[PDB]
Amino acid sequence: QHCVAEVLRLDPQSGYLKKLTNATSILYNTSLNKVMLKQDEEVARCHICAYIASQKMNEKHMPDLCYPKKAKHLMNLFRQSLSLLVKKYCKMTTEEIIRLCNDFELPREVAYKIVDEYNINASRLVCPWQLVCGLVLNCTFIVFNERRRKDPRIDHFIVSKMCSLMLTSKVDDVIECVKLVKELIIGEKWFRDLQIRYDDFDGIRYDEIIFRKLGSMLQTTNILVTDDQYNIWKKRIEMDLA
Amino acid sequence: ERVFQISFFNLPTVHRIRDIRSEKIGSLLSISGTVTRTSEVRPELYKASFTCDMCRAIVDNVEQSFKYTEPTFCPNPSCENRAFWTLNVTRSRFLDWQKVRIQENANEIPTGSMPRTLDVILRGDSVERAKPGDRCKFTGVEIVVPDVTQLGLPGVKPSSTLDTRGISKTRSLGVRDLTYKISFLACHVISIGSDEINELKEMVKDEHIYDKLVRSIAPAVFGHEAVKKGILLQMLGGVHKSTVEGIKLRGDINICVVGDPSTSKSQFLKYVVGFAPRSVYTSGKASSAAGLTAAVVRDEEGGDYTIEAGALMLADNGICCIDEFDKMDISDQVAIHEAMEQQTISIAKAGIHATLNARTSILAAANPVGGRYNRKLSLRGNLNMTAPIMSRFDLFFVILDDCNEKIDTELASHIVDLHMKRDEAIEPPFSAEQLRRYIKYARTFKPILTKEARSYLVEKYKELRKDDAQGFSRSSYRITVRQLESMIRLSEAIARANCVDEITPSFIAEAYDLLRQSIIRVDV
Amino acid sequence: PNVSRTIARELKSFLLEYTDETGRSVYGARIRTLGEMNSESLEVNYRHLAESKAILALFLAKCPEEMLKIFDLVAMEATELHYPDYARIHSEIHVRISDFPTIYSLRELRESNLSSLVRVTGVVTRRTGVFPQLKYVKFNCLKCGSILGPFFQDSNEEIRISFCTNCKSKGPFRVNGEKTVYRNYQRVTLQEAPGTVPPGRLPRHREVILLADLVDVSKPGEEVEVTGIYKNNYDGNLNAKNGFPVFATIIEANSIKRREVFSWTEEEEREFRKISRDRGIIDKIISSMAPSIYGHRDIKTAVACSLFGGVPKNVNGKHSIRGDINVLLLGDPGTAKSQILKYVEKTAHRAVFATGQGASAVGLTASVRKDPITKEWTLEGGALVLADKGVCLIDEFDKMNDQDRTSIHEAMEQQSISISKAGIVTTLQARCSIIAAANPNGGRYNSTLPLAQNVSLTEPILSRFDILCVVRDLVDEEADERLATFVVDSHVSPIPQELLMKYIHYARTKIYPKLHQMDMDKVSRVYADLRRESISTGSFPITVRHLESILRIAESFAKMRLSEFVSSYDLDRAIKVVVDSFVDAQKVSVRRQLRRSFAIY
Numbered sequence A: 001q002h003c004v005a006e007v008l009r010l011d012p013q014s015g016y017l018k019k020l021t022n023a024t025s026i027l028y029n030t031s032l033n034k035v036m037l038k039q040d041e042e043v044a045r046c047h048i049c050a051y052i053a054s055q056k057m058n059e060k061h062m063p064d065l066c067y068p069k070k071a072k073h074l075m076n077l078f079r080q081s082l083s084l085l086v087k088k089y090c091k092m093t094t095e096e097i098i099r100l101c102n103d104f105e106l107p108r109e110v111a112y113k114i115v116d117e118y119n120i121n122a123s124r125l126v127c128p129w130q131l132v133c134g135l136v137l138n139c140t141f142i143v144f145n146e147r148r149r150k151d152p153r154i155d156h157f158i159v160s161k162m163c164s165l166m167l168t169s170k171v172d173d174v175i176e177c178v179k180l181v182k183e184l185i186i187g188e189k190w191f192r193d194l195q196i197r198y199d200d201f202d203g204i205r206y207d208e209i210i211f212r213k214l215g216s217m218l219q220t221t222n223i224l225v226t227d228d229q230y231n232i233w234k235k236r237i238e239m240d241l242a
Numbered sequence B: 001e002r003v004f005q006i007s008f009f010n011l012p013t014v015h016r017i018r019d020i021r022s023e024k025i026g027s028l029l030s031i032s033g034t035v036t037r038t039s040e041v042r043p044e045l046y047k048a049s050f051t052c053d054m055c056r057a058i059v060d061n062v063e064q065s066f067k068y069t070e071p072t073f074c075p076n077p078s079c080e081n082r083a084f085w086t087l088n089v090t091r092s093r094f095l096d097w098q099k100v101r102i103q104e105n106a107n108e109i110p111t112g113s114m115p116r117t118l119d120v121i122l123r124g125d126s127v128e129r130a131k132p133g134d135r136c137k138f139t140g141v142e143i144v145v146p147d148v149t150q151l152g153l154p155g156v157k158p159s160s161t162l163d164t165r166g167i168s169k170t171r172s173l174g175v176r177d178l179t180y181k182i183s184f185l186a187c188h189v190i191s192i193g194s195d196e197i198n199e200l201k202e203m204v205k206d207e208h209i210y211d212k213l214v215r216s217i218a219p220a221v222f223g224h225e226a227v228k229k230g231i232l233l234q235m236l237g238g239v240h241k242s243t244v245e246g247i248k249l250r251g252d253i254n255i256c257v258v259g260d261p262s263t264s265k266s267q268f269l270k271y272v273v274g275f276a277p278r279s280v281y282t283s284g285k286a287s288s289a290a291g292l293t294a295a296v297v298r299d300e301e302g303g304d305y306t307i308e309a310g311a312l313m314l315a316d317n318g319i320c321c322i323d324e325f326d327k328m329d330i331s332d333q334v335a336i337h338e339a340m341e342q343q344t345i346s347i348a349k350a351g352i353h354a355t356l357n358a359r360t361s362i363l364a365a366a367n368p369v370g371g372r373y374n375r376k377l378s379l380r381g382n383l384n385m386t387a388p389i390m391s392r393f394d395l396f397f398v399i400l401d402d403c404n405e406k407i408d409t410e411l412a413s414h415i416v417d418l419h420m421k422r423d424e425a426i427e428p429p430f431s432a433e434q435l436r437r438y439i440k441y442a443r444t445f446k447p448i449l450t451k452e453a454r455s456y457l458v459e460k461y462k463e464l465r466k467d468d469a470q471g472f473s474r475s476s477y478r479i480t481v482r483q484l485e486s487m488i489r490l491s492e493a494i495a496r497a498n499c500v501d502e503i504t505p506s507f508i509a510e511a512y513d514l515l516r517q518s519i520i521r522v523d524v
Numbered sequence C: 001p002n003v004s005r006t007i008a009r010e011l012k013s014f015l016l017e018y019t020d021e022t023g024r025s026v027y028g029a030r031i032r033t034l035g036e037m038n039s040e041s042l043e044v045n046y047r048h049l050a051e052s053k054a055i056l057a058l059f060l061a062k063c064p065e066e067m068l069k070i071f072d073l074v075a076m077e078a079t080e081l082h083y084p085d086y087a088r089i090h091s092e093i094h095v096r097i098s099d100f101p102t103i104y105s106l107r108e109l110r111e112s113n114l115s116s117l118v119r120v121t122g123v124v125t126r127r128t129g130v131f132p133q134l135k136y137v138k139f140n141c142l143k144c145g146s147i148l149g150p151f152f153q154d155s156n157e158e159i160r161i162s163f164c165t166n167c168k169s170k171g172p173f174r175v176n177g178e179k180t181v182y183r184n185y186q187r188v189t190l191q192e193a194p195g196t197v198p199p200g201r202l203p204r205h206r207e208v209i210l211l212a213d214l215v216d217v218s219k220p221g222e223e224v225e226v227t228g229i230y231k232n233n234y235d236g237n238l239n240a241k242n243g244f245p246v247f248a249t250i251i252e253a254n255s256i257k258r259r260e261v262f263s264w265t266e267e268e269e270r271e272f273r274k275i276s277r278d279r280g281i282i283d284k285i286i287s288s289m290a291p292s293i294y295g296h297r298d299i300k301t302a303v304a305c306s307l308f309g310g311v312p313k314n315v316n317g318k319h320s321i322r323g324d325i326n327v328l329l330l331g332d333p334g335t336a337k338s339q340i341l342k343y344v345e346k347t348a349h350r351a352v353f354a355t356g357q358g359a360s361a362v363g364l365t366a367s368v369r370k371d372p373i374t375k376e377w378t379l380e381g382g383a384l385v386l387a388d389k390g391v392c393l394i395d396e397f398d399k400m401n402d403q404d405r406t407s408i409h410e411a412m413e414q415q416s417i418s419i420s421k422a423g424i425v426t427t428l429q430a431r432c433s434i435i436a437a438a439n440p441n442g443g444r445y446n447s448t449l450p451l452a453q454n455v456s457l458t459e460p461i462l463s464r465f466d467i468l469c470v471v472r473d474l475v476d477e478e479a480d481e482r483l484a485t486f487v488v489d490s491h492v493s494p495i496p497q498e499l500l501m502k503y504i505h506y507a508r509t510k511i512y513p514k515l516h517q518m519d520m521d522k523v524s525r526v527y528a529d530l531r532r533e534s535i536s537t538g539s540f541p542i543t544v545r546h547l548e549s550i551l552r553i554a555e556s557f558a559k560m561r562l563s564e565f566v567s568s569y570d571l572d573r574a575i576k577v578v579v580d581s582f583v584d585a586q587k588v589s590v591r592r593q594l595r596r597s598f599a600i601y
Ligand SMILES: Nc1ncnc2c1ncn2[C@@H]1O[C@H](COP(=O)(O)OP(=O)(O)O)[C@@H](O)[C@H]1O
Pocket: B388, B481, B482, C293, C295, C332, C333, C334, C335, C336, C337, C338, C339, C395, C396, C439, C483, C487
């Protein structure tokens, strides 16, 4: 039942969940009662089980359910028993770029946004590797400012990652990949919502920069260090005896 | 919804195992022999499904006798390799099985001979009609089976091989070696080896038929009435149930005798083993307890072990007549003691444990130290066997001779008359035939006590122990309470011998005088 | 059959609204107790859902190992509405059954009966292992450094995978025992009851599997009732089948018992103290010790002192004293010598019936023994070893060689064993109570000689016996009049023994009652008195060994009465015992000691 609920709640990755666990139960039951249905490794035995249980209740969905040789076999058997940017004009899918975005373990909402961007504005293109590259980079720089604000060892590792995920030794093209999308995507309300959420504004806060730029000297350029820093740095030399 | 069995009984001919050659193959042929073992019920492959290795297409048929391995034909033949197959268990039919090991009988045997043996196998509902340690008359057909035990043997050895001639361009020879044993099967088997009501109604009405039954049980032998009486009550068993705790009794009784050689002790053995339903004569010496009791297999022929049919395990509701008592080993008397103490046994080897049950009633044979029984010493210094084994015995006997010419002459007359072929010297009241049925009536009569009787039993034991009062004279083995329970089981046996329910003091007075006579005096 | 819909709703209806008497939902108690208990199992009486509807039992009988599927999940259902997060903790539930009427032997099994409900009888022997095997599986892959998800395992096979979620690669696979989850598996032997193997036949045997966290609920020598199912075993390597192609058979059994843990409650000890303090229990002790034989009271009393054990002490961890009591009996075999000791084995706590050679549990020593299973070297000890707190019985003490005698000597000497064999060296605690017996030379005791002169024993272990009791032929009429009457009536006040062992179990725990140095120099007095009176007419002496023993008896009776400390007018009992002990132990010359040493009575 644990494994049943596991594989059944593996579909997302009201009446649905209930009726589907009941379905898989009595389905597996019917399939194992008689002596007719054998040599079926339990390795895989809760999948077109789940697909036909989708087919049964009320509404069914061909996509995102089967997601192979024996998949067809067992189906019939049960059903009877009952570089990257020089490349010109490439093509992509939903899950291709879900992969290239989920490699950073970023959320799926940002990915859906880049997907919407694409399927509306993937029309007039030369190469979508550039656009989606720049997109997910300017997702990373905006959401990952904290860890980077304290760890400048990150910005080399990250750019190195996407330099070789798309197979180049030259990188200034990637720099352009970022600034051009930033020129493009600059002013949409959803981009706006993300900037108020994760608070980069060029990577710097609002309540600081406005005094940086309106015309002030109270502007806190933190050359000096904060108090808790020293409060914890002192422990390193406390035990200096050893 | 239909499977069947068949059998043909009352064939005219018998063939011993040696009387079977290679022309009786596929032939019904009736044999009789003996058993030493059974084995484990394991239900058998009658029918059994298979299925395609590439679809659910089932085949509900079976290659059945041997060749139990591979069908060919598929309903939808379109396959890359239809040659091999899958299987299934449930869409199947099964039927029981059983194995025994079959054995020669003594009364048909040659010289320089072992009881040559071999295996037989059962089938179907006729099973449960096997039995260990009994003669039986089988009937079936000369089934055979492969073997490789017969390797290392001389001359040339057949071998099978498919042909590669007339077809070509298609161990690669696929060679199998073939060499077999000749087992047997059985279609049916029987356990070899009314106005009787009026017969026995007439015999019972007498009074001295006690004496008749007494004297009729060894006309082959001369005198020694005590032997006759004791053996006649030995088969008779005592009620092992008369308790409340569930701690129990060795309901039956036990015996032995002493006597110098040149005596007719062994005549009695050969009699009773020549009469007894359940019995055995054995060595006394040339035996391990692994022979008396059961040493068993350790997982042979693949399948599980099976308790061996013990020799001393035998004598259920009977006897193990054993001669040559004195020359027994250390461990065998030990095992015997374990056998007698309770009516139960415990066994182990290779970690396996056992537990059995029996109520064996031994009669056996004493041989004194030098043979000469010094009449003025006591029993123990001459017997040479430790106390507990010397104990548990309700009885001891002694048979020793002396010069009496009047009677010695008629004894020699009897002996030499016995060298007249099948003479009428043994004219009894009657024969073994009615005796065996009389026993099967009488073994289960179950007698009862009374207050007068037991009240007299008490006072008679008082006088008995009062013979140990000035014991040590008419005394070679002294008194205890074993003697009284012995006497009580003897009253039980003897009322059963009478085939009447209520026992009186007069009948036990025979036991009174008996155990008074069972013992030996000595000098001042 | 897809009637799981009707079947499930109606069996859950049964499970919930069950009412039999007073509207009693009996199984609510079961499940709530389960959840209270972190329990894994639950029982369901077959007789009542069988009373209502038996085609329940039919769709069970056709394939009962498939009848399971609804019931285990239904247990979780009822469980979580009354115990959320139980399904979190206990991954799965098993069930148990009771009260099935059909009977088969271990031999009566026919093909028509299997794959259905089976109920047998037999005995559990040869218990092997509580081994673990799998129920949930995950992996360590090589082409990727990652895992598999969770997977339940069938009842009849291993598992192996060639697909991977990253690619269709059949890379090297290995299970992660360092993370997986397991359950309890036992292989068990089972044999018929020899009390009913009919004439001539032998008893067949079988093999048994025990699961569901019910392992080690059994021990060798128990009568058992496994209800279960039955089937074959396709355990591979089967094409090498000569003869006919016929297979073994094995039970999977669910329910289990032992019929066919002693401890004290508040009232159970309340009554103990109530009776212990009220007026001299000890007459009723010897009235209720062992009614096997009517016999005689004196040696019963001696061994009653042997029962309880006294108190040991050390003078700050030196000059130890033995608290536990010894005994030694002897006399003609005609009387009951090998009865009451086995009774005591039945009546004590952590008693033993060992023996010498032949019909023995063990050889009364310790040794580097093999084992039938897998050659497990082990260190068993003589039954002395087992009851280092308790007692060790023996019969036929005489029948021993050199070393089996030296061992018991060592025991009663320094209460510890030593071993110098086999790459192993050690001592233990042998502070056991000794009991024994033997057989005199010549049946009768030979009244006209002393002890060591009559029986051929040696003294140095003989000295440890505070008691050496003897009887002989009892020759008068009344002996007959009583013993024959009892032994025939065998076939024609005293308290339960359960209470008596529960009393000793209550006694060796609590009471260490003391002795007050108030008038104890009478010890010094009467000792010096009779130690001179001994030479006055006797040959051998009496020595401080006896004195120490009388003190141990004094504290013994203190534990018996359960009083707080020594009483004065019971030292009379202790010393009287040792007195009339030395009386019978000697020549007819002692017949003057009969008159001399009675004033101390
Ligand atoms: N007083 C008695 N009452 C009843 N039975 C007795 C009595 N005395 C002896 N017996 C029986 O006789 C036997 C005596 O055995 P025992 O002398 O202990 O054998 P061993 O001397 O070899 O240990 C006991 O088993 C007992 O059943």
